[PDB]
């Protein structure tokens, strides 16, 4: 069980750690989060009380280093940091715990939600898509744009999701125009899974990463990416049977976790109605279709 220590909390803020959140008042004696499960990536995220604009946060894996949060009064945000002095960091964390100034990551023993949402998300792969290579953790916020948006503008502060475009030469083999546009199996299996991602684990990883960014920060480019990766699978007639079974579980847990009041913005009626009711895979997503129909029958 690992710990993320805070220097202090100078400004009132709603802090989020994975799917949990709590409020810290301005200058409230608070020194961090303890009991963080080892073995998973995690995200610690922030919404200031005075400006609900700009949710922002940090993806991290406590196995890769000792991270602490320091509020910067010049840039006006809580920043994640690395302390290379292990001896000093361990001394600080112990001092904070003895003073009962750390909130406990509040995982229910029965509860596999976070595992199920992050099963194939990898930190080194996350760093490959956000190239601030000097840090072991990755910053994301509500405003960051994707390369697809950039085609239509700061390349360093962007999410380079894998580009998917159904009306592109990459997607469409010369002489197979109708075949490849109406059945995207070639693009899914040869171009993306065998030529870009390498395996389905990586495909699921970027799909899970795009959803979580869409959900925790309202990143439009992440929402677009999540919907595009679902649609590419559902629009393929030929999909490995284990991939379909796993996609159904992945989407089930994403829909289960989605805040009910954000569905209007985070769910795209066309993609979901096509995927569940028209596509090749309309009969292959039983768990996802059942929860969608019982939780969001209006969208459909």
């Amino acid at each position: 069980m690992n710990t993320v220590p805070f220097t202090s909390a100078p400004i009132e803020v709603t802090i989020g750690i994975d799917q949990y959140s709590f409020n810290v008042k301005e200058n409230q004696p608070f020194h961090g989060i303890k009991d963080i499960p080892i073995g998973h990536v995690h995200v610690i995220h922030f919404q200031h009380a005075d400006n609900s604009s700009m949710r922002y946060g940090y993806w991290f894996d406590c196995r890769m280093g000792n991270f602490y949060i320091q509020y910067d009064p010049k840039d006006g945000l809580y920043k994640m940091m690395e302390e290379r002095d292990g001896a000093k960091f361990e001394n600080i964390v112990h001092n904070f715990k003895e003073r009962q100034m750390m909130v406990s990551y509040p995982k229910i023993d029965e509860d596999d939600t976070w595992y199920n949402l992050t099963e194939f998300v990898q930190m080194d792969k996350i760093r490959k898509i956000v190239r601030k290579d000097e840090n072991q953790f990755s910053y994301v916020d509500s405003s960051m744009t994707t390369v697809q948006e950039n085609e239509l503008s700061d390349p360093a502060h962007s999410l380079n999701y894998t580009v998917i475009n159904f009306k592109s030469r990459e997607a469409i083999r010369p002489g197979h125009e109708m075949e490849d546009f109406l059945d995207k199996s070639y693009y899914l299996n040869t171009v993306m899974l065998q030529g870009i991602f390498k395996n389905s684990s990586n495909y699921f990883g970027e799909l899970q990463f795009a959803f979580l960014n869409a959900m925790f920060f309202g990143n439009y480019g992440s929402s677009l990416q999540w919907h595009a990766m679902i649609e590419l699978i559902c629009s393929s007639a030929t999909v490995p049977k284990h991939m379909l079974d796993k996609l159904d579980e992945i989407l089930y847990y994403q829909i289960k976790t989605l805040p009910e009041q954000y569905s209007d913005i985070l769910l795209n009626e066309r993609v979901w109605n096509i995927c569940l009711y028209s596509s090749f895979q309309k009969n292959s997503l039983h768990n996802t279709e059942k929860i969608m129909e019982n939780k969001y029958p209006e969208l459909l």
Binding site: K167, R169, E177, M178
Partner: protein, 237 residues
């Protein structure tokens, strides 16, 4: 964006463009089988690809053999159309290739866009106009070459005959659309109007009769009468 009444004179500027109409590509007769079920029998069709500035018509005849052994023929017909238009463009010298292709039905947009991915600078556009190009098969010489074809074939026409010697392309397109609208609303009456007078003939190298300027005014007026009329006999006004 979409072509409409507001941007109508853009058709007659000097940027090369083509209209593509696919409504006569897949044509069938519906009939009863010996068992009393219903079946279709395909007949020859055509793609209507028209330069509205010059009158040049690229009439690609679609022979029924292209449907043999295929499924979902109405969907295939749109993709076949896009394949043939893309082949036509690639066959033209660069300086003759269109800058825009306007499709008369929105269901042609994705098939044509995908077939033309190699031509990113050619705009594929829909239209809000309800153009009467389906009536092209009411032009006797066009219908004749389509129905006589025994293999795939492209035939070139000028749908304006020699009108551009005397009128502008705006006026020629307006006359064409009026004639085709009339043939579409009441084919018999329209054709009676056009051929009633046996002294006005159709030249061998033309589609329409050799009307004088004055006779075209009379003709056009009679076609307007017909379209409003039938618009009466239809809505009872």
């Amino acid at each position: 964006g979409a072509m409409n009444s507001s941007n109508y004179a853009e058709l007659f500027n000097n940027d090369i463009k083509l209209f593509v109409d696919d409504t006569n590509v897949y044509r069938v007769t519906v009939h009863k089988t010996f068992e009393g079920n219903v079946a279709t029998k395909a007949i020859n069709g055509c793609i209507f690809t028209l330069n509205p500035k010059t009158g040049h018509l690229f009439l690609k005849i679609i022979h029924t053999s292209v449907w043999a052994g295929q499924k979902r023929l109405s969907q295939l017909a749109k993709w076949k159309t896009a394949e043939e238009v893309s082949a036509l463009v690639r066959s033209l010298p660069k300086e003759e290739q269109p800058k825009q292709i306007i499709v008369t039905r929105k269901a042609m947009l994705d098939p044509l866009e995908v077939h033309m991915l190699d031509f990113p600078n050619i705009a594929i556009r829909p239209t809000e106009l309800r153009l009467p190009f389906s009536a092209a098969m009411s032009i006797d010489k066009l219908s004749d070459v389509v129905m006589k074809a025994t293999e795939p074939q492209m035939v070139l026409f000028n749908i304006y005959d020699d009108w551009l010697d005397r009128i502008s392309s705006y006026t020629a397109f307006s006359r064409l659309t009026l004639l085709l609208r009339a043939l579409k609303t009441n084919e018999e009456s329209a054709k009676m109007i056009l051929l009633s007078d046996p002294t006005i003939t159709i030249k061998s190298y033309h589609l329409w009769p050799s009307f004088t300027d004055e006779q075209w005014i009379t003709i056009e007026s009679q076609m307007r009468d017909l379209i409003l009329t039938e618009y009466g006999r239809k809505y009872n006004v």
